[PDB]
Design a protein around this motif. Structure first.
Motif, mmCIF file in Angstrom:
data_model
loop_
_atom_site.group_PDB
_atom_site.id
_atom_site.type_symbol
_atom_site.label_atom_id
_atom_site.label_comp_id
_atom_site.label_asym_id
_atom_site.label_seq_id
_atom_site.Cartn_x
_atom_site.Cartn_y
_atom_site.Cartn_z
ATOM 1 N N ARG A 1 -1.109 -8.593 -7.039
ATOM 2 C CA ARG A 1 -2.183 -8.008 -7.760
ATOM 3 C C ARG A 1 -3.321 -7.262 -6.868
ATOM 4 N NH1 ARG A 1 -4.830 -11.272 -11.688
ATOM 5 N NH2 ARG A 1 -6.183 -9.646 -11.345
ATOM 6 N N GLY A 2 -2.318 -6.479 -5.884
ATOM 7 C CA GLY A 2 -3.067 -5.439 -5.118
ATOM 8 C C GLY A 2 -3.081 -5.626 -3.443
ATOM 9 N N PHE A 3 -2.656 -6.785 -3.019
ATOM 10 C CA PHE A 3 -2.589 -6.904 -1.727
ATOM 11 C C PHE A 3 -1.897 -6.062 -0.756
ATOM 12 C CE2 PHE A 3 -2.036 -9.324 2.479
ATOM 13 C CZ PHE A 3 -3.173 -9.181 2.975
ATOM 14 N N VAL A 4 -2.200 -5.242 0.086
ATOM 15 C CA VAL A 4 -1.549 -4.473 0.697
ATOM 16 C C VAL A 4 -1.022 -4.921 2.138
ATOM 17 C CG1 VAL A 4 -0.986 -2.178 1.870
ATOM 18 C CG2 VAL A 4 -2.124 -2.557 -0.572
ATOM 19 N N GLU A 5 0.045 -5.444 2.519
ATOM 20 C CA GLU A 5 0.341 -6.281 3.672
ATOM 21 C C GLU A 5 0.818 -5.154 4.862
ATOM 22 O OE1 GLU A 5 1.913 -7.386 1.065
ATOM 23 O OE2 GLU A 5 4.282 -7.081 1.465
ATOM 24 N N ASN A 6 0.894 -4.136 4.415
ATOM 25 C CA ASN A 6 1.472 -2.947 5.389
ATOM 26 C C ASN A 6 0.201 -2.171 6.362
ATOM 27 O OD1 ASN A 6 4.432 -3.146 5.438
ATOM 28 N ND2 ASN A 6 4.323 -2.690 3.225
ATOM 29 N N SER A 7 0.601 -1.330 7.094
ATOM 30 C CA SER A 7 -0.541 -0.510 7.805
ATOM 31 C C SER A 7 -0.173 0.819 7.383
ATOM 32 C CB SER A 7 -0.772 -0.953 9.197
ATOM 33 O OG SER A 7 0.659 -0.323 10.039
ATOM 34 N N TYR A 8 -1.322 1.598 7.699
ATOM 35 C CA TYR A 8 -1.202 3.123 7.370
ATOM 36 C C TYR A 8 -0.019 3.749 8.510
ATOM 37 C CZ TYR A 8 -5.409 3.474 4.584
ATOM 38 O OH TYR A 8 -6.094 3.410 3.382
ATOM 39 N N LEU A 9 0.273 3.074 9.468
ATOM 40 C CA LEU A 9 1.467 3.356 10.414
ATOM 41 C C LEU A 9 2.934 3.179 9.919
ATOM 42 C CD1 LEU A 9 3.244 2.777 13.041
ATOM 43 C CD2 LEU A 9 1.882 4.656 13.027
ATOM 44 N N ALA A 10 2.920 2.042 9.195
ATOM 45 C CA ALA A 10 4.307 1.477 8.713
ATOM 46 C C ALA A 10 4.333 2.020 7.426
ATOM 47 C CB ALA A 10 4.167 0.037 8.751
ATOM 48 N N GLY A 11 3.383 2.604 6.758
ATOM 49 C CA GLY A 11 3.548 3.318 5.427
ATOM 50 C C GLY A 11 3.422 2.163 4.393
ATOM 51 N N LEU A 12 3.087 2.493 3.209
ATOM 52 C CA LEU A 12 3.091 1.551 1.935
ATOM 53 C C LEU A 12 4.336 1.659 1.073
ATOM 54 C CD1 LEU A 12 -0.468 2.529 1.280
ATOM 55 C CD2 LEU A 12 0.403 1.253 3.268
ATOM 56 N N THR A 13 4.668 0.496 0.634
ATOM 57 C CA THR A 13 5.628 0.558 -0.344
ATOM 58 C C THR A 13 5.201 1.188 -1.834
ATOM 59 O OG1 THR A 13 4.823 -1.743 -1.433
ATOM 60 C CG2 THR A 13 6.340 -1.808 0.487
ATOM 61 N N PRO A 14 6.142 1.538 -2.598
ATOM 62 C CA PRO A 14 5.792 2.294 -3.768
ATOM 63 C C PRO A 14 4.528 1.610 -4.652
ATOM 64 C CG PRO A 14 8.038 2.442 -3.528
ATOM 65 C CD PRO A 14 7.752 1.470 -2.608
ATOM 66 N N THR A 15 4.673 0.242 -4.862
ATOM 67 C CA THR A 15 3.933 -0.307 -5.794
ATOM 68 C C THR A 15 2.332 -0.437 -4.682
ATOM 69 O OG1 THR A 15 5.267 -2.105 -6.858
ATOM 70 C CG2 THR A 15 3.321 -2.582 -6.870
ATOM 71 N N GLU A 16 2.638 -0.615 -3.882
ATOM 72 C CA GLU A 16 1.535 -0.761 -2.740
ATOM 73 C C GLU A 16 0.691 0.809 -2.949
ATOM 74 O OE1 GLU A 16 2.692 -2.088 0.933
ATOM 75 O OE2 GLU A 16 2.869 -4.125 0.343
ATOM 76 N N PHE A 17 1.503 1.737 -2.893
ATOM 77 C CA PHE A 17 0.966 3.014 -2.867
ATOM 78 C C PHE A 17 0.040 3.412 -4.314
ATOM 79 C CE2 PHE A 17 1.436 7.518 -4.171
ATOM 80 C CZ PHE A 17 0.703 8.219 -3.083
ATOM 81 N N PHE A 18 0.801 3.031 -5.289
ATOM 82 C CA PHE A 18 0.188 2.974 -6.471
ATOM 83 C C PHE A 18 -1.271 2.342 -6.558
ATOM 84 C CE2 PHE A 18 -0.354 2.830 -11.228
ATOM 85 C CZ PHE A 18 -0.432 4.063 -11.688
ATOM 86 N N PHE A 19 -1.184 1.198 -6.143
ATOM 87 C CA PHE A 19 -2.405 0.245 -6.106
ATOM 88 C C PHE A 19 -3.715 0.888 -5.137
ATOM 89 C CE2 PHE A 19 0.128 -3.693 -7.138
ATOM 90 C CZ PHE A 19 0.213 -3.408 -8.406
ATOM 91 N N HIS A 20 -3.145 1.428 -4.309
ATOM 92 C CA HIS A 20 -3.858 2.209 -3.533
ATOM 93 C C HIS A 20 -4.697 3.240 -3.995
ATOM 94 C CE1 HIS A 20 -6.043 2.852 0.212
ATOM 95 N NE2 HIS A 20 -5.481 4.012 0.824
#
Length: 50
Positions: free
Chosen positions: A11-30
């Motif tokens: 549903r949109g929670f991003v558990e990564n940091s901008y240093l560790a990069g985002l997964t593709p699903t998290e990237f689209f949600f962001h």
DNA sequence: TGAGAGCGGCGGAGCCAGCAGGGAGCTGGGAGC
RNA sequence: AACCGGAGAGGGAACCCACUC
DNA sequence: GCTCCCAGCTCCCTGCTGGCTCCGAGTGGGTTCTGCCGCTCTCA
């Protein structure tokens, strides 16, 4: 995602940091999140100036 | 009367004006005498 | 042997793209 | 003929629906475009 998935990842929670990069699903949600603020910036001015 | 040519014509929100429907209130026809 | 400069035109409408917020 | 009460007409009110105006401030470029067909009169 599975149908009816209410979990944080689904549903949109991003558990990564901008240093560790985002997964593709998290990237689209962001992108979906940033689009909202970008739209409000343009919409707001036409009301505030009036 | 034919070429030159002059022109003749072929989205959204929110305030104001009109309309419709509905009662209180006044006046002639009948109720008693 | 004898004067010998000098300017003035560009306008509007519509559309699109972009920029700073 | 007399006063009076009950329906028919007058009024205002309320409610509802249709119509007009507004929608940030600047700036820079480029591009297209400014009507057209023909119909009758005149010089030859």
């Amino acid at each position: 995602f599975i149908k009816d998935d209410y979990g944080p990842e689904s549903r949109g929670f991003v558990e990564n940091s901008y240093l560790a990069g985002l997964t593709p699903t998290e990237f689209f949600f962001h992108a979906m999140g940033g689009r909202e603020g970008l739209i409000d910036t343009a919409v707001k001015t036409a009301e505030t100036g009036y």
